[PDB]
Design a protein around this ligand. Structure first.
Ligand SMILES: O=C(O)c1[nH]c(=O)[nH]c(=O)c1F
Ligand SMILES: O=C(O)c1[nH]c(=O)[nH]c(=O)c1F
Ligand SMILES: [Zn+2]
Ligand SMILES: [Zn+2]
Ligand SMILES: [Zn+2]
Ligand SMILES: [Zn+2]
Lengths: 362, 362
């Protein structure tokens, strides 16, 4: 007996096109999404070139429309030069992403004053998300309060971060957050198996106590999102390993395992992979779209999942219970038992749908 | 310039059919809903006969399918006899409603033990909502904790209730709540104008300090819902006035006025009349459905709104800014500038749609 779920949404993926297509492209990354039960993705802007101006967004839109197999929205990225310049295209993006810790030169912000300028100029009704680790969470929250608006914190990893967000929510502040599966199912204890290259990720893996704190504070977590960050094994094991893990194909199986163990309920999962993503990012429903899962089948994660070009996974060897059997996307069978059946280009930009525009006052 | 909103959802209406059709019926109450920008309603079970067993639910389903002009789900009601008997029909209902304070004999629960029995027997994945005033909020929260599940508190009216819910959410407890417009826009100060009959409602109107506390604690309010409770003027002004106000036609205009004054944002409103209702009650999207509003037009609420058979309103004389201009429901024009254009029977039971069933483990 299969369980029918709505179309799940991952608000944090890196699809690497343009400019890093040996790591992933729209076609391979959205195949990975469908195989993971994900029918809509929001793609980060740290591509090459990065999505920091209107021409780069226009190129990325066409590449996604031609390559994506599931539906999508594309983030814009904040830079040291573009505050006050994005107003005409802002509403066509998923939101604005701020890289407040480590990043590439083009996305680096030199001052908290530059963060303020973005919060002041980006349209007030549109989403802002931040990569913000440890005390940076408190700092960006202060900027949000000074500018009287909301913020969403990406990939929360540590006890100190989730407790700070919990304290802010207790004071009624408009902050939401997401947690990635590696910060719920891996810890420092796994670094000896993974090694120092494969284990590189930002935010870094937490301690066992960090992991325990995220589970204890599930009520504070608004979304799950993969931070799918594919790099090849050669890159992860080489002389200057880039940070990040692939995760689209493993996220739902890991979380279904936790549901079957009673660590959270099916509803808790659907709030965090469907309803809260929809409402925080103003993402539209997908007609005639659903995912059928088998909650009984036990399997062991292999050394690589079938679709991501990363061709490796940090979850190798973990035993899971739960598997995606079939995905229907807008009335067409998109995935069945390991086979993707919609071509590159089947996916659409949800911000172009009438129901996908963010409502605003005139 | 009109603003496009998604189809709004009111999770708390009394439509009086069967058995009280001089006060309202499915046809008139759903006309009132559409005129208020509401495209889906959840109807309470305290009809005559009340919806407390399978035969009564079957009758109500047919009356709604024949009379409703917008989409709907129907609540079941808890009684002193029906715990453990609703399992076959539970999933076809909006949820289970508990009347924990004043009510009719058939819906009266004699003991907190009977509340426990309902929490233990009603399927764990389906919604439970409670009419629970003052210390009853704490009492039903304790029952929810003892039985390890969630609860939703109807029409929160007082400072003491919203602060208790706030404290429970700070402890990570699974509780949500709704607030009705009369508890945001009327207070004891209005009882001299209204008089003692018209002013009768349960929960009663709060003090000015209660109203201020609800606004200050907006972050704690998950939903707005009208508690549309129509009675005729003759009944409200007679010797034994029944409690309740009509509210479908005035709820959105009142809240749009508050948006235009900066008391809450448009997003804050849409979370509370669209996204959070959807996610708490597992209500499906409505395809090709939207509401167009004019935020500039100032008008004064008259002595009765056009559609509700209540034919009176406690908001008479209030100045509002905001009006519903057009409603489209599943691809058909349903309302334009005071005219309803879909017939009785156009509305459907959303729990019969494949996407409207509540997901559960096998
Ligand atoms: O794009 C990436 O690989 C990446 N990887 C990470 O581990 N963290 C990031 O913040 C990031 F942008
Ligand atoms: O049905 C009604 O009129 C009604 N009216 C109220 O004012 N409160 C209730 O709890 C109720 F059930
Ligand atoms: Zn990041
Ligand atoms: Zn990322
Ligand atoms: Zn009530
Ligand atoms: Zn009621």
């Amino acid at each position: 007996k299969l369980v029918r779920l709505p179309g799940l949404i991952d608000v944090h993926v890196h699809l690497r096109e343009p400019g890093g297509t040996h790591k992933e492209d729209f076609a391979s990354g959205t195949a990975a999404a469908l195989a993971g039960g994900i029918t809509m993705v929001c793609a980060m802007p740290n591509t090459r070139p990065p999505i920091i101006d209107a021409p780069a967004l226009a190129l990325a839109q066409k590449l996604a429309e031609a390559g994506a197999r599931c539906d999508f929205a594309l983030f814009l990225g904040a830079s040291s030069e573009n505050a006050g310049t994005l107003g005409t295209v802002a509403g066509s993006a998923a939101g604005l992403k701020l890289y407040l810790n480590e990043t590439f030169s083009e996305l680096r912000l030199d001052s908290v004053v530059q963060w303020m300028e973005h919060f002041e100029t980006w349209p007030s009704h549109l989403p802002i998300v931040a990569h913000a680790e440890q005390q940076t969470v408190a700092a960006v929250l202060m900027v949000a309060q000074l500018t009287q608006r909301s913020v969403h914190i990406c990939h929360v990893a540590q006890k100190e971060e989730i407790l700070l967000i919990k304290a802010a929510k207790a004071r009624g502040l408009p902050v939401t957050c997401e947690v990635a599966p590696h910060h719920l199912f891996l810890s420092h204890d796994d670094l000896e198996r993974l090694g120092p290259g494969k284990g590189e990720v930002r935010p870094e893996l937490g301690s066992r106590q960090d992991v325990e704190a995220l589970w204890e504070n599930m009520a504070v977590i608004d979304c799950f999102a993969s931070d799918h960050a594919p790099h090849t094994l050669e890159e992860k094991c080489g002389s200057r390993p880039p940070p990040g893990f692939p995760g689209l194909e493993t996220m739902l199986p890991l979380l279904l395992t936790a549901v079957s163990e009673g660590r959270l309920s099916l509803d808790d999962l659907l709030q965090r992979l469907h309803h809260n993503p929809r409402r925080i990012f103003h993402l539209p429903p997908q007609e005639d779209t659903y995912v059928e899962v088998d909650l009984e089948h036990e399997w062991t994660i292999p050394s690589h999942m079938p679709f991501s070009k990363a061709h490796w996974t940090p979850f190798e060897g973990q035993k899971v219970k739960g598997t995606v059997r079939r995905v229907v996307l807008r009335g067409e069978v998109a995935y069945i038992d390991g086979q993707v059946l919609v071509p590159p280009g089947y996916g659409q930009d949800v911000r172009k749908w009438p129901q996908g525009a963010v409502p605003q006052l005139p």
